[PDB]
Amino acid sequence: RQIQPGSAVTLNPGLVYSSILTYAMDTSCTDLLQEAQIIACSLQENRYFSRIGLPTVVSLYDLMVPAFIAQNSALEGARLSGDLSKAVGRVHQMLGMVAAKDIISATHMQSRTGFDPSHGIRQYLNSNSRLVTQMASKLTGIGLFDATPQMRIFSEMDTADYADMLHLTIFEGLWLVQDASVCTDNGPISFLVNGEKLLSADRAGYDVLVEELTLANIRIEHHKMPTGAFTTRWVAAKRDSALRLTPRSRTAHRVDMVRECDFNPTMNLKAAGPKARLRGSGVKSRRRVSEVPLAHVFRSPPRRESTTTTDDSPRWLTREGPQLTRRVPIIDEPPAYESGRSSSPVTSSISEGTSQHEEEMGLFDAEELPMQQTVIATEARRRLGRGTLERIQEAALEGQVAQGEVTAEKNRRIEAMLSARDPQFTGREQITKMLSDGGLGVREREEWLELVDKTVGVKGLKEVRSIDGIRRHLEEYGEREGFAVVRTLLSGNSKHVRRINQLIRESNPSAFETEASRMRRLRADWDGDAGSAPVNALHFVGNSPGWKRWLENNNIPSDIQVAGKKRMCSYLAEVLSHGNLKLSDATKL
């Protein structure tokens, strides 16, 4: 028996969703698929009035009478991420405009009235669409003021009519587009009409710062302005010359990690391992927190996503490089705080409201833990004031154990990489991705990209979890581990970027240079739409070096234009590396 007046409840995320999941497993668990969409349409309503979307007059005779055989079906497992849950609904209402505008505008060519025909279409033939998510709802309304707002093209597939198609095919689009678009002008110069699918959105944003310081240082020896004496040889004879390159150029920028949902192995019943192993740690009679499904979810669904908790590790390991070389200064930002809670019996269950939970005193030394804790603190502002510094928003990790805790900051050389491996050794190997994608020459490439624009880059999610006492350990080991990058030879990364600077310069000759109309006159380029495959500019980038896992795109169109202003003057970089395009001499003829 519960209490009406005296009692008072406090609840954050994890109690509200848990009460629904435990309630969902009783009856109508398959409705969770359809459920996640309708609430998205509800919170943000656009061009919607007196909606009659989802019909379910709550006739609930079965919950009175339990002992009903539970239906085993597929699970949705829809995780409403803080920012993404709104965005899903913001896309639905925006898709709803594309469906609504198709039927409302087509019959509006009558000069006198537009009620009798539009009021007649009560049938849902309109509701049937093409591409993105559309669930079994409805939208029978009586307002009819859909002429004011403009069409927002998110769906680039067939099945349109009259007004929506008129943008694409017929020349009358110049007249249509002028009506379609309000608050924006620019329509005089254009001849003919075609609508494309470019979705880069400018903010946004950023910033930061711081410081630091401490110291330390370192050584070595010195680094931080080395001079390279390149030698070119094409016949028996040879020419040789010296040049210099500096890491420290431009400041700030960095990346805002994108938000994404989490999902699981699809079946109703609970796993035996996760339940039996949850019992091994605690000794509670009934479940503290008062949640059964959410205790099993966070463990089973997300196997691993080690990308933003990781990337700072090889970043500090390649940040350590130019600092170990000569470590005169060192600075450590004020939050050196670790979210390390001491002596808590059964909070670990309720504490899963936070992103992750890692156990101490189990393949976790006093040296291994601080790496997991340095990351929680903001990146950069360590060892070297300038150079390889930038900013990243990071997750919220929390170490936990009844007894153990140790702190540390200073690392040793030839042991930082080994001690950075160890937290990967147990858990699973997803850190190689950021060691390759984010670790290699995308840092100094983005550093050189800072010249034109700044502060818009993102790929590869945020947080990860796996532990609550002990690991299963029925997989990968790596007893012997050493690669060239860990050694004091980071120029394999920096001189890789100098090569890419030529490839960004290699798009210019085919583009324009004086004989073609000068910058800010032609603008007849065809690159940069936050798309990689059929765009051309990033295809040359994706031809060999650093393909397939970055944002970049949006900053390239400006880089090609600004590079022409430098190239016409006496300014350029360096020569020759694994290139082969015509209209400009990569090799020779």
Binding site: N217, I218, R219, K410, R412, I414, E415, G482, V486, R487
Partner: protein
């Protein structure tokens, strides 16, 4: 926090170190002394005076 060319010990070897002035003393024996016989064995056996 140690230079130059630091390693963890006998286990976990990486790329080859260079040489600079010490940080701490290095005393203990290396087990290539069994291979050091190869020196003695090859030259005391094959020899003019013998």
């Amino acid at each position: 926090m140690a230079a130059p060319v630091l390693y963890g010990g006998a286990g976990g070897t990486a790329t080859g170190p260079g040489d600079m002035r010490r940080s701490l003393m290095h005393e203990k024996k290396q087990v290539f002394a069994e291979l050091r016989r190869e020196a003695q064995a090859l030259r005391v056996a094959k020899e003019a005076r013998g």
